[PDB]
């Protein structure tokens, strides 16, 4: 459509948590288009110019004491505070997946659907034994609705009287999910 | 298991439009509606367990504009290089006839965060039953967006997700049908 130049300013305040809140890290990042020009890292304590465009802001911001204090407290006042408020339904959110096995579209496909979080382990079994052979997976698709999806198929020429299994481990389940489909 | 919460925002000139949103591990917790000054939760239930002073976000956007001014001048008006989107359309689950599903249009890896998206069923529009997400940030600082269309599969119908972006030199139609 247009061609009239666009100017984009991006800002990102990141809270990285490790083992719950045992190790919080705050990043205050500013970008010009896709370019990060300056950033504050909690494990560093001050502003660092990421590119020469940020040199001016870093030298000035880092001289303000009230502002620095505030960014330094952020891991507590901001990161930890917010974690405790949303953990109730973000970190602890769990939706079991719906597993489906169908011949294919000879590929025996295994479709694990509508689950959350991301942690997932899907294995295929040839008559009881695992198959790390010819297993193409479509990574881990994100649906944009706090739901994930992934397809993992088995490349094979099925014989008669042979059980094929798809095991699915997932935080939302106590026992592993299993879908057996022989032939 | 590392977890990450990010407060993402942006301001775009000359469109004079911005965004303010919270992200948890790549998903949107909510974003702020600048005009109504209300906080729009990605999921209805989220508002039951939390809240956010929606208006404070304007202060951030106001400064992000201020800085774009400064920043756009220190670089001597170097505009942004467009990056057309990679569009995909897959079903929300395995497809079965006469069995209700949801078509999704994954628009991803692109900038600026401006785009026109239209769903077409049998070559014509569908302005009802559709929803959409705002621009979600990417690890590389580009964006992704989701558009959705609830539908009843049938050989009888064919669909197109039409997308217009400035990086493209012509609208894009990613097809989806039942073979």
């Amino acid at each position: 459509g247009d061609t009239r130049p666009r100017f984009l300013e991006q800002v990102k305040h990141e809270c990285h948590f490790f083992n719950g809140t045992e190790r919080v890290r705050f990043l205050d990042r500013y970008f010009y288009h896709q370019e990060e020009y300056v950033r504050f890292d909690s494990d560093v304590g001050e502003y660092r110019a990421v590119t020469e465009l940020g040199r001016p802001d870093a030298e000035y911001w880092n001289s303000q004491k009230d502002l620095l204090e505030q960014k330094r407290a952020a891991v507590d006042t901001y990161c930890r505070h917010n974690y405790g408020v949303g953990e109730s339904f973000t970190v602890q959110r769990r939706v079991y997946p719906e597993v489906t096995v169908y011949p294919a579209k000879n590929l025996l496909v295994c479709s694990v659907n509508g689950f959350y979080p991301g942690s997932i382990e899907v294995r295929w079994f040839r008559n009881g034994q695992e198959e790390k052979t010819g297993v193409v997976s479509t990574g881990l698709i994100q649906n944009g609705d706090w739901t994930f999806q992934t397809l993992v198929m088995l490349e094979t020429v099925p014989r008669s009287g042979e059980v094929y299994t798809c095991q699915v481990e997932h935080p939302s389940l106590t026992s592993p999910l299993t879908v057996e489909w022989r032939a | 298991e590392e977890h990450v919460i990010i407060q993402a925002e942006f301001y775009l000139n000359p469109d004079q439009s911005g965004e303010f949103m919270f992200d948890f591990d790549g998903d949107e917790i909510f974003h702020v509606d600048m005009a109504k000054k209300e906080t729009v939760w990605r999921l209805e239930e989220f508002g039951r367990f939390a809240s956010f002073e929606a208006q404070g976000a304007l202060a951030n956007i106001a400064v992000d504009k201020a800085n774009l001014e400064i920043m756009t001048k220190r670089s001597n008006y170097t505009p942004i290089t467009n990056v057309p989107p990679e569009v995909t359309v897959l079903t929300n689950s395995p497809v079965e006839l006469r069995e209700p599903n949801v078509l999704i249009c994954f628009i991803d890896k692109f900038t600026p965060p401006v785009v026109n998206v239209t769903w077409l069923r049998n070559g014509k529009p569908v302005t009802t039953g559709v929803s959409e997400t705002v621009f979600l940030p990417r690890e590389d600082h580009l964006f992704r967006k989701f558009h959705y269309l609830p539908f009843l599969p049938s050989t009888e119908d064919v669909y197109d997700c039409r997308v217009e972006h400035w990086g493209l030199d012509e609208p894009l139609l990613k097809h989806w049908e039942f073979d």
Partner: peptide
């Protein structure tokens, strides 16, 4: 939620 430019 508390907000942190």
């Amino acid at each position: 939620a508390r907000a942190x430019s």
